[PDB]
């Protein structure tokens with residue numbers, strides 16, 4: 484049993500809810516929250532800007548030190564950093580940004596990072612301002628992630644479309 488409430492079960496391991504990932508993290512304090520990161524860990528907007536704002540910019544301060552030491556992530560890659568006030572850990576995952584021309588095939592590689600964690604609270608990778616089709620992102624998630632993933636979908640309209648079109 485775990486703390487996640489109000490989710491619709493899509494598969495053995497994938498659950499979905501209409502919710503702002505920030506408010507969900509604040510309530511649940513999951514072991515792992517996933518950030519929709521870029522390779523520079525510049526948390527300006529979208530999910531990343533919202534998570535970072537909720538940490539009072541502590542996520543950005545920690546991320547800048549990580550990049551100064553290690554250099555940029557790979558598209559499809561990840562790093563584990565603090566979850567600050569939102570979670571034990573934040574798994575920063577870089578999905579391909581369609582609005583930058585990145586290979587959508589890298590979306591599967593991005594979701595593979597989730598398999599290193601038994602349970603996660605996450606957004607749909609490469610959705611929102613990253614430009615991918617969220618229906619596609621959900622299909623890749625279900626076909627790639629084998630650990631237990633609780634997906635928070637910000638837009639109520641999109642949530643209803645994801646559920647009603649799910650195969």
Ligand SMILES: O=C(O)CCc1nc2ccccc2[nH]1
Pocket residue numbers: 503504505528529530531533536537611637
């Ligand atoms: O007002 C805020 O602090 C952020 C609101 C918000 N919540 C989000 C969740 C996901 C993506 C962008 C988001 N923007």
